[PDB]
Design a protein around this ligand. Sequence first.
Ligand SMILES: CC(=O)c1nc(NC(=O)[C@@H](C)N)sc1-c1cccc(N)c1
Length: 130
Amino acid sequence: SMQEEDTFRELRIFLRNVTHRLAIDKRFRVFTKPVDPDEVPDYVTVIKQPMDLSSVISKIDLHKYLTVKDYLRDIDLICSNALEYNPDRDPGDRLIRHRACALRDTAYAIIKEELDEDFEQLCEEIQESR
Ligand SMILES: CC(=O)c1nc(NC(=O)[C@@H](C)N)sc1-c1cccc(N)c1
């Protein structure tokens, strides 16, 4: 219905705003664009499902997220990919892992503070009805 399309449009506006706030944070610059195989050849051999904040924005605009949980699964994938690709004790690895955990914690904290729980529940119930 039109009432349901209005709900999903509000969800997309909310998700674009969260993603923008993550993408302008200097700590998260390494997560803003797809990893370039020219700059990192070994990446596609370790990471089977790449994800980044620019790809998240594209998926919002393709109506791929109908619930906040679907969105957080891709935020969680950005983080888990970084942890898997950077497992070593070296300072370069530890720095990326710290930033990845901060990206995940920041996204969850914004949603916990700013998303109405009844709004997320409505999105879930519309989705389960389709
Ligand atoms: C996001 C990620 O997993 C990632 N990990 C790196 N690890 C390392 O450089 C070594 C030291 N552990 S670099 C890097 C990355 C990816 C895209 C762009 C830029 N600037 C960095």
